[PDB]
Design a protein around this ligand. Structure first.
Ligand SMILES: CCCCCCCCCCCCCCCCCC(=O)OC[C@H](COP(=O)(O)OCCN)OC(=O)CCCCCCCCCCCCCCCCC
Ligand SMILES: Cc1cc2nc3c(=O)[nH]c(=O)nc-3n(C[C@H](O)[C@H](O)[C@H](O)CO)c2cc1C
Ligand SMILES: COC1=C(OC)C(=O)C(CC=C(C)C)=C(C)C1=O
Ligand code: FES
Ligand code: FES
Ligand code: NA
Ligand code: NA
Lengths: 412, 406, 195, 201, 248, 446
């Protein structure tokens, strides 16, 4: 590969043809092989870390959540299908859905005796097409801007593509996934100059676009389980209706315990369900210093304080008032947003003091939307997007206090 | 019925609103006269009513401030030192004034609106402006598009100015046809190639421009000057012809024009560093004064060089004078290269543009090109190109002074 | 009580800038610098907190139907009355600041000419007539709308200042990117829409 | 002719200038309201410019703004009555933005920039031209927002909807605030790539 | 010159006001008719009377519709200017309205007018149908509807939502003709003379007496519709009036 | 006294032995023009000219009166010039022992000397160039004065020599130099050192301050920020301990003292140690027969801040007290960015190397990645102990917002103060150059 990559560089050079594809060919060469660049001036030595390794660490950090998500997505769907149909009726349903008979063809079974392999396989049939569509469509916009503007491709899109695919319902139509990533990549990032030069979270901007443009496909009772003809409310929606007592899984008929939500054995977005899986990945990137623990700490502080305040105030009518902090933690997309989306460094505050305020605002807003906004059962995406708008302001307040300390010579 | 009530109610509301505004203005907006001190002299202090720009009040008094763009804040030649008052510096002013200058208090009088008492410290040069109407003596054409103008002082003595200065010329509306101009036969033949006499200029309103001096200080009685005719671009015929330059060319012996005192900021440095001159077109006026000033007025022994850009032997002028100065004093040497010698010129010397000729002849082998004072005046193409070569030689901007005439 | 919801409604739930699109010309213009943007927001609040309650009394005492006389309703004299009154108060406030509060004139009076006949003030007063608000509600609403307007402009100024590091394509640089930026801001402010 | 079309693509009040943005983002959800709004702004802008020019020499600078606003406000009040009496349905849709025409920066900008220092006849044409360019952006945004958000143009079903036994699913974001912001920005981008002179340094 | 300024402002104010005053006062009659026909177009549509054009709407509304005022506390007809009655304005004033308790306010409406207008459809000298305006808070905005109740006082003939602000596709489907058409033939009350109309999440059983399919993916808006009928058909709404209708 | 916790000590292999030995004989010396910030030279010598030890070679046009004098006596063999005729170096071939002498004083008189007298001797001898001003890291103007002169008697640069070992051999000169600085300063002299003991001045003006912590704890910029914060109106002077010994020698013997002790160290240096050399010594001759085979990079100064010693720049810098030699890191590795970094050092904990604590790394000149836009993961805050918001400041430098950078503390910074920020940047920005671009803009516009 090394010899082939080096030799073909002549063609992609300005003298040779296909120069318009240099930004993509050089990306492949640099992607496979680290460049042989040496420092040109001081510092003559550099840290081993680079943008490529940072993104891959985040990309790997969500793998455990992604793998469980596929397993959970298949499990929820298979359970619902058997709870709704049986016998030849199930066979017709399986025959009328390419997700179902493709799983049968590859060795899985849609029967209730299905093991983890068939459930994970079935969940893959939903996740992979979404991820492939998001990667290809979003990657096309990335290369187009780089090619036209003569920029080198940036590796930040790897995190955006995977995260966006893991925050959508399993049943999301592909054509809507293409539009969602297109809005997030283009409107939120590229027109600002690409990775590191924007202010809004790209993946959440794409989800918000679908959230407000096609609400029927990303809300309600028909999108969070991939069993055709099945209707089931998620835990957050159920709590808003009848409190903790309403937390029931109709497909399986079993009550939803805190442990169930914690492990991720609940309907929802593929990737968000398992708080345990997200914590495992979040621990690594936080330990590695890639994700800010001040933002994560701030989010927890804001969530616990406001939720406890709602607990004390009480409400005989709004059941969301009595949801405790530890239930807020394991429900919806709070865990996913706090660890892998609130920590987006570009859209977060650039000062350590601001990061605390930035995270606290995120945590406060999520509970607020969850509790006192009837329309939306969850508000993590909206909370983060709202917090992005004010992150530069927290930095400005902190920096202006720094400037006042300096004009006083730090009291020296 | 309702129509009547609305009509009266409408008027009451409007009258009540304006009466409050009009009443408030009288009791909140002072109408006292504004007093501005010029250079701290009580006699020069000017009392002016509120309103208007600073450039207007000063002009009425005995101090005249140079201005090219006028009330647009574009040229920046009207910079004044405002010790106090006038508020903060406007963002447009910063475009032509550096931050350090703003700390000193430099401001544009035209861009500054007079609304409160202000203190000004205008220098002697701006303070000492005298308006005179000299008499035109000769208007012969020096070259194809260059005319030498001689002005006779009307009040006697001579105009006090420094080498490389200029005088602002103001003229009223007047219609002049290029056919009215008188040109020698030598240059007439070249003019006959395109028949530029067809052009006709009609200056609708009075105009003000600047013109550099071409007489060294010791010269008394005649104020030599060089004028370049303004014509529409060869590639853009749909442009009005010259308005101020054309009017000057229409004048002959016995004509009168105003000089409105001297001005300028183009001068040499009182040091022993070698001087280098790059003249072009109308630039031969200020350059000539420097050579004359440094030969008899000061009798300077410093090295002096001149590099004039010309297109043909006909364009060359003052050659006989230059030869005498070089021959009489060896400290000064002049050179010129022809960008396109005529077939009959039979030039056997430097050929091309001074952009590369000067480098390939003098600056290439110069041991300390940076340790030299550079003065330039000529077409923008020659000026812009030359500085790039000078920049490539490590010549600092502070060592080069530009006086481009356009 | 009732006032806090009204104050909360006029800041977050109802956003005069990002939802009703009022004052966009000035909002999308002076947004470059946070310090200047903060000054305009303060100036807008002063005009709004004074304009709305003053117009509320005028509307309820003169323009309100069947108020001056029985059977006559001078509703059509609504736009002229409000715009004229708003112009007077803004103009009157500026002059007194330059005569008694020099420091406030530069901080607040400098922006007042822009706030004269501004869509932000007129729209807020118009909504105060489209509804039935008491004088106390008029003041709480007027103060709330201005502060919420200040929140959006001050937020947009932080983003624009942060965008000094951005690389916007030519054609979008300046106004074009700012409109996109404002659109993104409106996206995040729709979290309170259902509230 | 040149002056009439100058404020369309060369000196657009909303693309190059930032005047009239408030109405652009509010009424462009439908072409009927958008189209009617252009007529109201054109009618007021042209008349206000015409009248202010007639009394320009006699207008006192002390209360000039009041005089200009009274003329503008009076016309808008008249326009409000016409809309209420005729096109009542459209009047209800426009909500309070008919009155906001008075504060529309285009109306006041031309009343001072041009009408106060211009002959009344060309002043009227300037008002018509500015209203035209204002409507060019208003109608362009209205076209996409109605077509993509409802599948309808002027209330006529262009794209059959799934809810009505069709194939097209309308985009809900085209009805909300952000869409107008994004469409205008991309419209400015398109305009400035074909007229690079308007690019900001 | 203060005299010059006063002359221009006074003269300009007088002429401009005259045009404004004349325009508003003169066109007021036309404006009143235009506003009215919008409500008449809806009432005719729910009534099943096909009309087209302002002239036809006005002519047919007067011929077939007889607006009347009703007192909720008694459910008995009262005398007043029904044709020019604004129930919304009345509901905002304590003189002609009341404040509901939290328990009573099933429809979540803050206030309810003491007297509300109703519309009777008459083929001839006989009332073939009664139209009852009912409103209740939705997810996003107050929703106003017209309900055409047959002479029986139980069966519903037509429904239409003429003012709503729910999300199109999810909650704005109350305007969908297919969903509205499902109400025809349903019964507002059960045998025990109690509200029985129920919005069934997931779709009502076919042939249901009181089963209307809820709006798919729009439980919150569908909940509002249920709350509207649970209140307006109850004691504090049109319940007592419908009891009188059942017996004449 | 002042303890630093935010910073980074780079564990590069080849630390010096901290024993002073005699280096290879040097027959070539040069002064480097680009090293002096904002210096436009006025040449006073030509190739083939004979010069004395302390004879003037060139003058500064924008700093009149400052004389850059030769370190050695000999012949001028070349005057290297670069793009735009930028003076790179003036190489002098060592020959003879002629020198320019000056006045000499007893150690007990130095503290009492007149300030103008001290300035004249320092300027004429060329030793005035040892001082650098903060802000702008320029040679102080002849007529200027400073209320705070900072003496850097410590070195936390990687592979740096220990000042205590050098200062101990020249205790009297160092104390004599401090006495001269006591009279030169209008205010006080800050002797910034480590906890170890050093010779002390008996003048009340000379105050000893201890700084503990990693790099940047031994940087003059760090010391100024904690003891005498600088601005446009509060200018401090910086001088290193070896120049202080030179100042003391000049006023004790009346001769320019040009001997220096520099650490020759690095992964490819066979015997890393301290060597005695001369100012501007040819590094090609200094490192001869002391480096491992291969393509190496010789650096005047530290690997964090320093000049590539190649061609006309292959001479010891005026302010550099060490020579670091590294391998050129041109190797391309398959998925090198994706490997567990047992042998990779990082500020982050994303490599295995940080687990093997106490390990040393054979760092090369590899950039360890391509150039990318800043993605701040908090690396800058981890190595920046000053009271600043580095990410915001670095963004200002990237955008060229000179005025904003001034508000955020750019005027307090020299290039070396941002070396760690450059080192840890995932986007591979080089903030030292950006800071200089901002500082130059402020000087010119101001
Ligand atoms: C990181 C890259 C992106 C993410 C990629 C994620 C890919 C997910 C693929 C899931 C595949 C799971 C296969 C697990 C095999 C072990 C099976 C096991 O332990 O569970 C048993 C369970 C139930 O058993 P049953 O199906 O009933 O068969 C036995 C009948 N007596 O199940 C079974 O017995 C297994 C029945 C299914 C066998 C399928 C084999 C071929 C298809 C799977 C591989 C391709 C997946 C798609 C492409 C991915 C490419 C990245
Ligand atoms: C810790 C971390 C978190 C990230 N989170 C997100 C994210 O939530 N959404 C996204 O689109 N990109 C994310 N990225 C990728 C990238 O930084 C982001 O798109 C920036 O906004 C691009 O400038 C993340 C990167 C890192 C290192
Ligand atoms: C980092 O490396 C990257 C590539 O490497 C080959 C890509 O092709 C592309 C482009 C992808 C597609 C599907 C066109 C992107 C976006 C990218 O980031
Ligand atoms: S006259 Fe040109 S700047 Fe004032
Ligand atoms: S249109 Fe200009 S502020 Fe509203
Ligand atoms: Na969970
Ligand atoms: Na909620």
């Amino acid at each position: 590969l090394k010899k082939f990559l080096e030799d073909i560089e002549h063609h992609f050079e300005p003298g040779g043809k296909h120069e318009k594809w240099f930004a993509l060919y050089e990306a492949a060469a640099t992607l496979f092989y680290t460049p042989g660049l040496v420092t040109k001036r001081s510092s003559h030595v550099r840290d081993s870390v680079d943008l490529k390794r940072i993104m891959i660490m985040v990309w790997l950090a969500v793998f455990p959540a992604m793998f469980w998500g596929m397993y959970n997505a298949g499990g929820q769907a298979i359970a619902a299908l058997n709870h709704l149909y049986s016998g030849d009726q199930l066979a017709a349903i399986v025959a009328g859905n390419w997700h179902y008979w493709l799983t049968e063809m590859l060795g899985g079974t849609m029967s209730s005796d299905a093991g983890w392999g068939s459930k994970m396989l079935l969940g893959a049939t939903y996740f992979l097409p979404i991820y492939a569509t998001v990667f290809i469509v979003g990657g096309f916009w990335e290369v187009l801007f780089c090619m036209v503007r003569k920029h080198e491709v940036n590796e930040g899109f790897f995190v955006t593509s995977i995260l966006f695919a893991l925050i959508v319902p399993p049943t999301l139509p592909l054509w809507q996934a293409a539009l969602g990533i297109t809005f997030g990549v283009v409107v939120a990032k590229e027109v600002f100059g690409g990775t590191g030069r924007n202010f809004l979270n790209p993946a959440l901007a794409g989800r918000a676009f679908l959230f407000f443009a096609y609400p029927a496909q990303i809300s309600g009772d028909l999108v969070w389980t991939a069993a055709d003809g099945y209707s089931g409310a998620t835990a957050l929606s159920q709590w808003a209706q009848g409190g903790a007592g309403a937390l029931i899984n109709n497909a399986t008929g079993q009550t939803i315990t805190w442990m169930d939500a914690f492990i991720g054995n609940i309907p929802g977005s593929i990737g968000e369900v398992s708080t345990l899986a997200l914590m495992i990945g979040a621990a690594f990137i936080v330990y590695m210093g890639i994700a800010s623990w001040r933002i994560i700490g701030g989010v927890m502080i804001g969530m616990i304080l406001l939720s406890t305040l709602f607990n004390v105030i009480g409400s005989d009518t709004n059941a969301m008032f009595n949801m405790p902090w530890h239930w807020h933690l394991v429900l919806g997309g709070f865990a996913f947003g706090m660890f892998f989306m609130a920590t987006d460094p570009v859209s977060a505050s650039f000062t350590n003091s601001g990061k605390w305020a930035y995270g606290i605002l995120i945590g406060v807003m999520c509970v607020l939307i969850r509790v006192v906004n009837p329309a939306y059962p969850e508000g993590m995406m909206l909370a983060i997007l709202f917090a992005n708008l004010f992150a530069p302001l927290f930095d400005h307040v902190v920096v202006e206090r720094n400037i006042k300390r300096r004009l006083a010579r730090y009291g020296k | 019925s309702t129509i009547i009530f609305g009509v009266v109610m409408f008027t009451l509301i409007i009258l009540a609103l304006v009466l409050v505004i009009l009443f408030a203005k009288s009791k909140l907006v002072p109408t006292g006269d504004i007093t501005i001190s010029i250079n701290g002299d009580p006699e020069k202090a000017i009392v002016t009513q509120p309103g208007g720009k600073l450039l207007t009040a000063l002009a009425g008094a005995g101090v005249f401030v140079s201005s090219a763009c006028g009330g647009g804040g574009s040229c920046g030649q009207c910079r004044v030192k405002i010790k106090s008052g006038g508020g903060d510096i406007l963002p447009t002013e910063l475009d032509h004034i550096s931050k350090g200058e703003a700390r000193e208090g430099e401001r544009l009088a035209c861009q500054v609106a007079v609304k409160a008492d202000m203190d000004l410290e205008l220098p002697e040069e701006i303070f000492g402006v005298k308006k005179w109407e000299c008499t035109v003596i000769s208007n012969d054409n020096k070259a194809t598009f260059i005319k030498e103008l001689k002005l006779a002082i009307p009040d006697g003595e001579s105009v006090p100015f420094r080498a490389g200065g200029y005088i602002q010329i103001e003229a009223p509306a007047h219609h002049v046809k290029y056919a009215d101009f008188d040109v020698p036969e030598k240059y007439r033949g070249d003019w006959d190639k395109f028949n530029l006499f067809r052009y006709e200029s009609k200056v609708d309103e009075p105009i003000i421009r600047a013109y550099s001096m071409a007489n060294y200080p010791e010269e008394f009685g005649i104020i030599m000057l060089n004028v370049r005719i303004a014509t529409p671009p060869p590639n853009n015929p749909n442009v009005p012809p010259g308005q101020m330059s054309s009017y000057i060319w229409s004048l002959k012996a016995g004509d009168k024009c105003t000089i409105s005192g001297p001005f300028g900021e183009f001068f040499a440095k009182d040091t022993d560093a070698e001087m280098v001159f790059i003249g072009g077109g109308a630039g031969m006026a200020p350059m000539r004064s420097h050579i004359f000033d440094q030969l008899k007025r000061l009798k300077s022994k410093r090295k002096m060089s001149y590099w004039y850009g010309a297109r043909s032997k006909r364009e060359m002028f003052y050659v006989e004078d230059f030869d005498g100065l070089a021959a009489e004093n060896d400290n000064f040497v002049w050179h010129c290269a022809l960008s396109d010698p005529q077939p009959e010129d039979n030039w056997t010397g430097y050929t091309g543009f001074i952009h590369n000729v000067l480098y390939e002849n003098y600056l290439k082998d110069h041991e300390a090109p940076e340790d030299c004072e550079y003065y330039m005046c000529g077409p923008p193409m020659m000026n812009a190109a030359v500085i790039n070569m000078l920049k490539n030689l490590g010549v600092e901007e502070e060592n080069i002074l530009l006086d481009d005439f356009g | 009580e009732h006032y806090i919801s009204l104050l909360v409604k006029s800041i977050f739930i109802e956003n005069m800038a990002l939802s009703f699109f009022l004052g966009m010309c000035t909002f999308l213009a002076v947004s470059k610098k946070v310090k200047t943007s903060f000054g305009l927001g303060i100036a807008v609040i002063v005009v709004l907190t004074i304009s709305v309650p003053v117009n509320n009394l005028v509307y309820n005492l003169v323009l309100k139907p069947d108020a001056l006389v029985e059977g006559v309703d001078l509703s059509f004299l609504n736009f002229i009355t409000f715009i004229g009154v708003i112009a007077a108060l803004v103009q009157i406030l500026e002059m007194i600041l330059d005569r008694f509060f020099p420091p406030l004139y530069n901080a607040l009076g400098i922006f007042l000419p822009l706030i004269t006949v501004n869509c932000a003030i007129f729209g807020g007063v118009s909504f105060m007539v489209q509804r039935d608000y008491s004088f106390a509600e008029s003041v709480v609403y007027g103060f709330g709308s201005g502060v919420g307007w200040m929140l959006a402009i001050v937020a947009l100024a932080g983003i624009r200042e942060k965008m000094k590091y951005s690389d916007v394509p030519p054609g979008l640089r300046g106004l074009g990117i700012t409109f996109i930026t404002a659109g993104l801001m409106a996206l995040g402010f729709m979290s309170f829409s259902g509230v | 002719k040149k002056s009439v079309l100058a404020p369309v693509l060369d000196n657009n009040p909303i693309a190059l200038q930032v005047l009239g943005v408030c109405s652009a983002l509010a009424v462009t959800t439908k072409l009927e309201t958008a189209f009617v709004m252009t007529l109201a702004v054109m009618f007021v802008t042209a008349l206000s410019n015409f009248f202010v020019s007639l009394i320009r020499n006699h207008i006192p600078n002390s209360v000039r703004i009041i005089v200009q606003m009274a003329i503008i406000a009076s016309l808008v009040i008249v326009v409000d009555q016409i809309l209420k009496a005729y096109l009542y349905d459209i009047s209800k849709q426009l909500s309070v933005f008919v009155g906001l025409i008075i504060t529309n920066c285009i109306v006041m900008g031309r009343a001072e920039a041009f009408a106060m220092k211009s002959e009344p006849i060309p002043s009227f044409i300037d008002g018509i031209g500015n209203g035209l360019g204002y409507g060019f952006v208003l109608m362009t945004v209205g076209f996409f927002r109605e077509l993509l958000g409802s599948g309808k143009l002027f209330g006529l079903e262009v794209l059959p909807l799934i809810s009505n036994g069709g194939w097209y699913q309308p985009n809900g974001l085209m009805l909300l605030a952000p869409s107008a912001f994004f469409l205008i920005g991309f419209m400015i981008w398109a305009i400035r790539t074909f007229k690079p002179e308007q690019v900001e340094a | 010159s203060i005299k010059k300024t006063l002359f221009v402002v006074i003269a300009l104010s007088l002429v401009c006001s005259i045009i404004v005053s004349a325009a508003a006062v003169g066109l007021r009659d036309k404006q009143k008719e235009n506003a009215a026909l919008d409500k008449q177009s809806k009432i005719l549509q729910v009534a099943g009377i096909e009309a087209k054009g302002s002239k036809q709407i006005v002519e047919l509304f007067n011929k077939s519709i007889e607006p009347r005022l009703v007192d909720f506390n008694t459910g008995d007809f009262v005398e007043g200017d029904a044709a020019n009655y604004d129930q919304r304005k009345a509901a905002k004033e304590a003189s002609e309205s009341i404040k509901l308790t939290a328990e009573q306010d099933k429809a979540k409406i803050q206030r309810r007018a003491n007297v509300g207008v109703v519309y009777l459809v008459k083929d001839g000298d006989k009332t073939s149908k009664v139209i009852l305006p009912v409103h209740g808070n939705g997810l996003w905005s107050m929703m106003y509807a017209f309900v055409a109740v047959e002479t029986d006082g139980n069966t519903v003939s037509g429904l239409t939502y003429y003012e709503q602000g729910e999300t199109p596709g999810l909650g704005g489907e109350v305007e969908n003709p297919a969903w509205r058409a499902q109400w025809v033939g349903k019964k507002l009350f059960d045998e025990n003379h109690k509200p029985a109309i129920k919005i069934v999440k997931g779709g009502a059983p076919q042939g249901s007496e009181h089963g209307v399919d809820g709006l798919s993916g729009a439980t919150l808006t569908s909940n509002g519709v249920q709350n509207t009928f649970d209140f307006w058909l109850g004691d504090m709404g049109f319940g007592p009036f419908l009891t009188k209708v059942r017996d004449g | 006294m002042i303890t630093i916790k935010k910073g980074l000590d780079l564990p590069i292999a080849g630390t010096p032995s901290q024993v002073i030995s005699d280096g290879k004989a040097i027959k070539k010396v040069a002064l480097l023009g680009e090293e002096y910030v904002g210096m436009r030279p006025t040449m006073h010598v030509r190739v083939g000219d004979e010069v004395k030890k302390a004879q003037i070679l060139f003058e500064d046009k924008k700093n009149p009166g400052v004389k850059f004098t030769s370190p050695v006596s000999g012949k001028v063999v070349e005057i290297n010039r670069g793009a735009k005729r930028v003076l790179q170096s003036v190489v002098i071939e060592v020959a003879g022992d002629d020198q320019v002498t000056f006045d000499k004083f007893e150690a007990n008189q130095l503290a009492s000397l007149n300030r103008d007298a001290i300035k004249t001797q320092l300027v004429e001898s060329g030793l005035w160039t040892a001082f650098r001003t903060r802000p702008f890291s320029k040679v102080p103007a002849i007529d200027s004065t400073s209320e705070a002169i900072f003496v850097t008697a410590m070195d936390t640069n990687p592979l740096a020599a220990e000042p205590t070992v050098v200062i101990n051999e020249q205790s009297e000169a160092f104390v004599a130099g401090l006495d001269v600085l006591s009279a030169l300063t209008t205010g006080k002299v800050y002797v910034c050192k480590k906890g170890t003991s050093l010779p002390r001045s008996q003048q009340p003006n000379v105050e000893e301050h201890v700084f503990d912590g990693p790099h940047p704890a031994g940087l003059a910029g760090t010391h100024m920020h904690f003891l005498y914060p600088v601005s446009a109106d509060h200018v401090a002077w910086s001088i290193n301990y070896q120049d202080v010994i030179a100042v003391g020698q000049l006023f004790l013997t009346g001769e320019l003292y040009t001997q220096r002790v520099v650490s020759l160290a690095g992964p490819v240096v066979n015997k890393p140690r301290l060597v005695r050399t001369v100012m501007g010594a040819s590094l090609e001759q200094l490192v001869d027969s002391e480096i491992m085979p291969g393509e190496v990079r010789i650096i005047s100064g530290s690997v964090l801040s320093g000049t590539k010693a190649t061609g006309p720049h292959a001479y010891l810098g005026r302010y550099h007290l060490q020579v670091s030699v590294l391998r050129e890191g041109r190797d391309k590795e398959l998925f090198g960015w994706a490997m567990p970094g047992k042998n990779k050092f990082s500020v982050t904990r994303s490599f295995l190397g940080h687990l093997f604590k106490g390990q040393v790394y054979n760092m090369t000149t590899t950039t360890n990645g391509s150039d990318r836009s800043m993605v701040p993961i908090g690396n800058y805050e981890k190595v920046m102990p000053l009271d600043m918001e580095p990410t915001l400041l670095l963004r200002d430098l990237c955008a060229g917002d000179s005025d904003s950078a001034v508000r955020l503390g750019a005027l307090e910074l020299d290039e070396e103060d941002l070396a760690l920020c450059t080192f840890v940047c995932p986007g591979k920005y080089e903030y030292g150059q950006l800071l200089r671009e901002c500082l130059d803009k402020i000087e010119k516009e101001g």
